[PDB]
Nucleic acid binder design. Structure first.
Ligand SMILES: [Mg+2]
Ligand SMILES: [Mg+2]
Ligand SMILES: [Mg+2]
Ligand SMILES: [Mg+2]
Ligand SMILES: [Mg+2]
Ligand SMILES: [Mg+2]
Ligand SMILES: [Mg+2]
Ligand SMILES: [Mg+2]
Ligand SMILES: [Mg+2]
Ligand SMILES: [Mg+2]
Ligand SMILES: [Mg+2]
Ligand SMILES: [Mg+2]
Ligand SMILES: [Mg+2]
Ligand SMILES: [Mg+2]
Ligand SMILES: [Mg+2]
Ligand SMILES: [Mg+2]
Ligand SMILES: [Mg+2]
Ligand SMILES: [Mg+2]
Ligand SMILES: [Mg+2]
Ligand SMILES: [Mg+2]
Ligand SMILES: [Mg+2]
Ligand SMILES: [Mg+2]
Ligand SMILES: [Mg+2]
Ligand SMILES: [Mg+2]
Ligand SMILES: [Mg+2]
Ligand SMILES: [Mg+2]
Ligand SMILES: [Mg+2]
Ligand SMILES: [Mg+2]
Ligand SMILES: [Mg+2]
Lengths: 294, 273, 45, 165, 188, 331
RNA sequence: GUUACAGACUUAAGCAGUGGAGCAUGUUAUUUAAUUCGAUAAUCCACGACUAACCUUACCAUAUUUUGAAUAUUAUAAUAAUUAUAAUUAUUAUAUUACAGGCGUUACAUUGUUGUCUUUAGUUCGUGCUGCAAAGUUUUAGAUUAAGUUCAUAAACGAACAAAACUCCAUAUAUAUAAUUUUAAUUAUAUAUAAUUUUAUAUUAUUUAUUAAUAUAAAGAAAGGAAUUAAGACAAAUCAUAAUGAUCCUUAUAAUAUGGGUAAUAGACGUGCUAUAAUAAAAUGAUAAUAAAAUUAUAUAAAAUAUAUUUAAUUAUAUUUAAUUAA
């Protein structure tokens, strides 16, 4: 040790040289230097202390303890921004997390689509673009415990492309009903099916299927008839792509049971012409289509 | 200059940022006593391009103040920004406290590194007063940053045998001190705090010591040779401490049983490097 | 708080406690349960 | 990172931090000067007064400050500027602090008691009383004049009426 | 080549160095007390460093016994005397002793440390001075003159850019050096 | 890490970046031999805190009332001076001052903080000097969020959001509180912290071995002074690649808010006349880096886990008194 | 006024007690001008209250004050300070709108805090699955644990508040500090390590060592206490710590002084103290057998003296303050 002015005058500020010289002329060279592990005084990193680091040293002008700037020499006047912001990259985002962004205007459909693609193989673009959301049954459901009545939000929604697929999903949440709709949207996209339609317009023939206590009587319709059916079925049809229908609900008229029954009826109660012809060994002809043919 | 903010006439030509800082300083130090001046506007108007604010806006902000900012904005900030989600750009309070701890630690390390060595210019050799010439010891007490009433106390302590007194005078001194002298260690002892300053107490103690010395050296009337020295107070004092005055018997020692250093060939051969 | 005006006339402050007090007395005045008028010593003898 | 501008620590600056009670008599002179400065309300522990602020230069070092009995609200006195400020520097405080002078009261001899009473035994009893009061009052913290007044009243010279009763 | 780190900045990373005691006559006894230990120890370490660079032998922080005060109080506001709670307070104390040092050097040390104090720590200083059996107390005029000369020499400035001053220091020096001090002692 | 096989017997939590100094557990940090002086200083501290609370609220006009929320003042008494420290939040952030028109006028808050220290003779520090007989300084520290301090968070929700829970907690308001912070993986953060500390220790240990094994191959036995001296080598190699730009930030503790709870207890809801309590518990309330690594938790005031910062503030509504209790955990 | 299973000084055993006597203290009841108020099953009753002569004190008697304890509004005048006889400011006094003040009522309007269930082991959430659904699952067949503790199977896989752990007193060891006259180093207090012990053998029942309890062995200094008492319930306690909502008083339900009461006593009651004698009481025991933890700037008070009291000692006052504001 005991460096000369070479490699020392050009590396340390000039004003700090006299102190270094006095330290060299005071501390005997070849003096043993204990390390104290009862008290911590030096930083855990090497530092010469020649430069006042922002965010790791007191800001000049800040009225702090150990502020040597008299009382009328404080040089901070605008208390509007955060003095001494973070150093380096300027943020402490931990690994594996993303900086929050617009969430109020970010559609929940995008969140559902991303999550489903994460777990299942479905693509997000189709869910976001070609699927329609419309709730069916929103209501507060209450269970009582030792604590007391516990209220839960039960939401049932349908999702379809107006081109053949429709799904039904129910979700419960105690935090809020928006969450219940989120779970229902999640489930319904998970539970999508394919509905056979006659000329992409109406069902094949008439259906008289029974769901638990709900008697679904549905009959086909003329072109341009419109959905002259119960509102639950009307919503299911409009989301599923059915445009002309007519029917009546008998016995129980519970909305949720109606929705489940009509989805099932579309799925399995009806049969396509091609399947009947193949299993029959016969030929079924649409007179309307062949009358207007070439 | 320290008073540069007070004089806005000489602000002309200064950089816009320095102009703004000066203007802020002037209206921050003055407070309610701040008064607008034309030169300050002319200096401020030169900074329109620096902060991209139209001149007329600067005039209205100078005059109307926060009301000016409100009426140029066209509407108050109607949004509950308080509950904004974290951007991970600031530290919690307790983390900042930890940072401030390190800031103080770095401040003290820097002080020790660079300011402290400059204290080596005030080293002075200890000019030791001769013990024989200076036997009496005065103890002064100080409380830094407080006004404790004990700061006035002064204690005088000296050995009687080093007073320089003859046998008869020493005996008279010892028997006149009464409880203030302990024969076990031969230390005279005396404190005073009646007076409200240390200087007065020290003078009082010195005068009492002179008075006692003068009387002790005056053997014309009575030398108090017959009356023995009383030691009952010391007996009482010593009876309130534990006496560990027992030593290991000399004849129980067996030095032959101590271990002898063994032969270390490596250590023997390492002496020659 | 009373001395802040003497030192710093520029900045206006609000004493939430005093404002709550005056709000409460006014509400009682409006409700009709105001403080009765205290009678002066000169009354009677 | 701004360069560190070292400022040499010098004894003159480090003054105002000297221990209040130090054996050397140079420290006695310095501490006396500081005591005189602070008793005169010279600006220490706070920013000094210059002419920049005209109607907002306040000081709270009026004699009533801290005390209760002279019931009044906070006096906001008009502080003097840094100049035209007076320093007391009382010589009695100097001897009291820089030197170690102490009055130690004044003993009463039988001449004084005999001026009043005629019975020798009563004179002897009064002498003893004056001695006892003299030796038992020098350690009590009060002013010299009040201590003398109590000393005379208790000894017998001045009647009780001298005190406020 | 590589960055050099001189001893002043090397010493910061190692335990403070203590100068040896040569004669053995005590000159001060500074006791630091705090209700915690971290600040006390850090400040102590600083005191040792300041003393060493100033040429003052210091022994080091001696762990004097801590004092535990204890109070007890019923937890409930009104009436549950059965439930009680214990509160305690600890006074951590250290002792540093200075030997074989001139009075003015010790004054320099104490001044510096009090200037750069820390939160929570309190300091009480015991000063020992050896003196004659009999001292001349009437010697004032010559004594005052020599004392004023010593004050002027001690607080004498040489450089200008460095050695930051204090307004109070200037005021005290000007008062002491003012000729009107002479008539203060001329009251006789 | 629990293993620490290739380091050696050591360990020092005393770093000022990994533990909160116990002096900070107290609002007044003073020791005085004159206990009467200590008591009066404590009383003055409490009084001035209340005065600053009075000072904070400001109004520009009838329709502008600005409440500046501040935390408990940290009074730091040293032998020569006193410092008053507090964090504050200004709701009137004015679009984060994005527009530059702010440079030409001081809002009420700037003037308030300026008279705290900067005003020449009329600043508060002068008056507080009269009360304390020493130099006094005040530290205003700005906080850009309200959930970074339990004091500011409780005070804000107790003094500025009456309309949001007076008649029950609104759905949007309750949702915003539950989404103040992203749900972070406490386990990953704790393990990352442990690995970083282990890496620092290994790097330093390797520096020792490399330095001592070579030491430029000059210093040898009988020259190292193996009896008492421990000077191993140049300070440069002791902390090679261990500098201010990598070490301190990754050893700093109490960075992230993982759990937070708010409790609205009182007469808020205008029910038949009873009281209701609404609790919003989000996250976790235990520090995972204290039971796996070798650092040990310290209990503030012998009853508060260090990782917990909690506070409650009261107020008065038309029905009576209510209390908002906020407790935060900072891993 | 339902069944089964375990714990806990619940019980059994042991030691000491209460209930019996006298006294101290709280309560009831009663008396009284007042015997102020509250607590009053476990969860009140030497409780709020860590000391009721005056104060305190909230009660009774008799006298006495009326914008009072602040904050604001408007006039009149006086004093002090600072600038060059004037100007400004701060305070004081006299008024009035204006209230202030309340231990008055409501713990069944409240904040905060607390007692009991309670060192008890429970209380919930995300995704998945089951039932049309409310819901359920996880939170369990069977065992183990102090414990939703840990396993085994199981639509479940995880997580949060509790459990445990970190924490503090204490323990063993290492390093450092202390010029071993602040001594005691047999200590003090800073950092760290250690154990929620490990290993081996055998005898057991078992899911077969891919194991539990029984003992042994040997390696260890290694064995305790404190804090923390979840969710809900008791409309449990508190408006007499303090604070607010509503209602009530404003020459009185607010404020001051002199006395008294809170200390009364038929009965009853819960806590304790002291005794009813010889495995137990009394005197004496000066190289003064042997402690720990606490206190002394609103002080602690030694030694010596006179006294009762005899030579002295012990015991209690008085005389006088030695030393110390404390390893
Ligand atoms: Mg319906
Ligand atoms: Mg002793
Ligand atoms: Mg039994
Ligand atoms: Mg009986
Ligand atoms: Mg009995
Ligand atoms: Mg009796
Ligand atoms: Mg009673
Ligand atoms: Mg009651
Ligand atoms: Mg009375
Ligand atoms: Mg009222
Ligand atoms: Mg009353
Ligand atoms: Mg209740
Ligand atoms: Mg309550
Ligand atoms: Mg289903
Ligand atoms: Mg269960
Ligand atoms: Mg010893
Ligand atoms: Mg636990
Ligand atoms: Mg509970
Ligand atoms: Mg239960
Ligand atoms: Mg009740
Ligand atoms: Mg009551
Ligand atoms: Mg009250
Ligand atoms: Mg009355
Ligand atoms: Mg009573
Ligand atoms: Mg009891
Ligand atoms: Mg007996
Ligand atoms: Mg002891
Ligand atoms: Mg002890
Ligand atoms: Mg005695």
């Amino acid at each position: 040790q005991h460096y000369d002015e070479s490699l020392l005058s050009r590396y340390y500020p000039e004003s700090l040289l006299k102190s270094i010289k006095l330290a060299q002329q005071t501390i005997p060279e070849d003096t043993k230097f204990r390390v104290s592990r009862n008290v911590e005084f030096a930083p855990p990193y090497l530092d010469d202390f020649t430069k006042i680091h922002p965010f790791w040293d007191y800001k000049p002008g800040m009225p702090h303890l150990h502020a040597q700037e008299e009382n009328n020499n404080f040089s901070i006047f605008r208390w509007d921004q955060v003095q001494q912001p973070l150093p380096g990259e300027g943020n402490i985002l931990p690994p594996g997390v993303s900086l929050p962004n617009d969430g109020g205007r970010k559609s929940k459909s995008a969140d559902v689509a991303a999550g489903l693609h994460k777990q299942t193989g479905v693509d997000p673009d189709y869910i976001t673009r070609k699927l329609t959301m419309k709730p069916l049954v929103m209501k507060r459901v209450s269970n009582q415990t030792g604590k007391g009545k516990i209220a839960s939000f039960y939401a049932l929604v349908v999702v379809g492309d107006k081109n053949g697929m429709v799904g039904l999903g129910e979700g419960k949440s105690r935090e809020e009903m928006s969450k219940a709709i989120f779970k229902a949207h999640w489930d319904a996209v998970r539970n999508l099916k394919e509905i056979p339609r006659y000329e992409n317009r109406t069902i094949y023939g008439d259906i008289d299927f029974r769901y638990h206590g709900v008697k679904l009587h549905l009959r086909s319709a003329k072109p341009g008839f419109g959905l002259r059916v119960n509102h639950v079925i009307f919503e299911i049809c409009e989301c599923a792509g059915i445009k002309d229908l007519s029917g009546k609900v008998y016995k129980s008229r519970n909305d949720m049971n109606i929705a489940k029954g009509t989805i099932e009826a579309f799925t399995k109660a009806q049969k396509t012409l091609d399947e009947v012809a193949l299993g029959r060994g016969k030929k079924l002809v649409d007179v309307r289509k062949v009358y207007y043919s070439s | 200059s320290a008073d540069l903010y007070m004089h806005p006439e000489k602000w002309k030509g200064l950089p816009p940022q320095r102009i703004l800082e000066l203007y802020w300083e002037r209206m921050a130090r003055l407070g309610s006593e701040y008064k607008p001046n034309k030169d300050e506007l002319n200096a401020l108007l030169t900074t329109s391009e620096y902060s991209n604010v139209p001149v007329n806006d600067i005039k209205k902000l100078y005059h109307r103040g926060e009301q000016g900012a409100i009426d140029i904005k066209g509407g108050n900030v109607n949004r509950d920004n308080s509950l904004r989600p974290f951007m991970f750009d600031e530290l919690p309070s307790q983390a900042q406290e930890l940072v401030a701890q390190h800031r103080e630690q770095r401040f003290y390390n820097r002080l020790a590194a660079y300011e402290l060595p400059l204290l080596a210019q005030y080293r002075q050799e200890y000019k030791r007063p001769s013990p024989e010439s200076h036997p009496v010891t005065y103890r002064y007490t100080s409380y830094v940053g407080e006004e404790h009433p004990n700061s006035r106390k002064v204690v005088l302590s000296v050995k009687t045998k080093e007073l320089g007194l003859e046998e008869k005078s020493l005996h008279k001194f010892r028997i006149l001190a009464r409880s203030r002298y302990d024969h076990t260690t031969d230390i005279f002892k005396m404190s005073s705090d009646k007076f409200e300053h240390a200087s007065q107490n020290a003078r009082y103690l010195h005068d009492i010591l002179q008075r006692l010395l003068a009387e002790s050296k005056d053997l014309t009337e009575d030398d108090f040779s017959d009356v023995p020295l009383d030691t009952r107070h010391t007996i009482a004092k010593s009876l309130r401490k534990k006496k560990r005055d027992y030593e290991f018997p000399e004849h129980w020692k067996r030095p032959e049983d101590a271990p002898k250093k063994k032969f270390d060939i490596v250590d023997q051969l390492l002496s020659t490097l | 708080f009373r001395h802040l005006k003497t030192l710093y006339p520029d900045i206006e402050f609000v004493d939430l406690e005093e404002q709550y007090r005056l709000s409460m007395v006014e509400a009682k005045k409006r409700r009709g349960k105001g403080a009765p008028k205290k009678m002066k010593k000169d009354a009677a003898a | 990172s701004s360069e560190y501008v070292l400022e040499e620590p010098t004894p003159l600056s480090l003054l105002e931090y000297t221990p209040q009670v130090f054996p050397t008599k140079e420290s006695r002179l310095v501490n006396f000067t500081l005591d005189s400065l602070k008793k005169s309300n010279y600006p220490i522990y706070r920013s000094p007064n210059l002419g920049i602020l005209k109607v907002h230069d306040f000081t709270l070092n009026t004699p009533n400050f801290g005390k209760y009995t002279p019931g009044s609200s906070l006096i906001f006195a008009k502080e003097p500027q840094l100049q035209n400020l007076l320093i007391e520097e009382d010589p009695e405080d100097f001897h009291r602090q820089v030197t170690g002078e102490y009055q130690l009261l004044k003993p009463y001899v039988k001449k004084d008691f005999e001026k009043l009473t005629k019975s020798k035994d009563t004179v002897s009893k009064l002498v003893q009383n004056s001695q006892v009061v003299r030796l038992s009052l020098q350690s009590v913290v009060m002013g010299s004049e009040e201590k003398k007044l109590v000393y005379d009243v208790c000894s017998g010279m001045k009647p009780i009426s001298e005190l406020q009763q | 080549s590589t960055r050099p780190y001189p001893v002043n900045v090397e010493a910061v990373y190692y335990a403070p160095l203590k100068l040896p005691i040569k004669y053995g006559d005590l000159v001060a006894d500074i006791q630091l007390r705090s209700y915690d230990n971290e600040n006390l120890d850090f400040y102590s370490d600083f005191i040792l460093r300041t003393g060493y660079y100033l040429g003052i032998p210091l022994t080091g922080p001696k762990p004097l016994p801590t004092r535990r005060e204890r109070w007890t109080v019923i937890k409930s506001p009104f009436v549950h005397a059965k439930s009680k709670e214990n509160f305690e307070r600890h006074t951590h104390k250290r002792l540093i002793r200075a030997w074989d040092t001139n009075p003015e050097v010790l004054q320099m040390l104490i001044a510096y440390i009090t200037k750069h104090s820390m939160a929570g720590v309190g300091m009480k200083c015991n000063f020992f001075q050896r003196s004659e059996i009999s001292l001349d107390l009437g010697s004032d005029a010559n004594g005052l003159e020599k004392s004023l000369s010593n004050i002027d020499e001690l607080y004498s400035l040489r450089n200008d850019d460095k050695a930051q001053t204090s307004a109070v220091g200037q005021k005290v020096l000007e008062l002491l050096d003012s000729p009107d001090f002479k008539k203060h002692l001329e009251k006789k | 890490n629990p293993v620490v096989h290739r380091i050696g017997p050591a360990g020092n939590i005393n770093n000022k970046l990994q533990h909160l100094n116990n002096m900070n557990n107290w609002n007044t940090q003073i020791y005085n031999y004159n206990k009467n002086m200590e008591i009066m200083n404590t009383m003055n501290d409490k009084l001035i805190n209340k005065l600053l609370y009075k000072m904070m609220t400001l109004k520009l006009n009838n329709m502008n009332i600005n409440k500046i929320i501040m935390s408990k003042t940290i009074n730091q008494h040293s032998l020569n001076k006193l410092n008053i420290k507090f964090y504050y939040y200004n709701n009137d952030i004015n679009n984060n001052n994005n527009n530059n028109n702010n440079n030409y006028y001081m809002n009420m808050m700037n003037k308030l903080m300026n008279i705290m220290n900067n005003n020449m003779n009329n600043n508060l520090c002068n008056i507080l000097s009269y009360y304390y007989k020493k130099k006094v300084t005040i530290e205003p520290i700005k906080l850009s969020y309200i959930y970074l301090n339990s004091d500011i968070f409780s005070k804000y929700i107790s003094l500025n959001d009456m309309d949001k829970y007076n008649n029950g907690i609104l759905t949007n308001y309750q949702r915003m509180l539950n989404n103040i912070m992203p749900k972070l993986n406490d386990h990953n953060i704790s393990m990352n912290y442990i690995n970083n500390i282990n890496n620092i220790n290994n790097n330093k240990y390797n520096n020792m071995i490399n330095l001592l094994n070579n030491n430029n191959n000059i210093n040898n036995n009988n020259n190292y002074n193996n009896n008492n001296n421990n000077y191993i080598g140049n300070i440069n190699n002791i902390y090679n690649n261990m500098t201010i730009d990598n070490i301190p930030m990754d050893i700093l503790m109490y960075k992230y808010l993982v759990g937070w709870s708010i409790k609205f207890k009182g007469r808020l809801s205008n029910n038949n006349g009873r009281t209701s309590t609404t609790n919003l518990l989000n996250g976790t309330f235990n520090n995972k880096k204290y039971l796996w690594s070798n650092i040990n938790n310290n209990y503030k005031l012998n009853y508060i886990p260090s990782n917990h910062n909690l506070y409650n503030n009261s107020n008065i509504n038309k029905n009576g008194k209510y209390n908002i209790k906020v407790k935060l955990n900072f891993i």
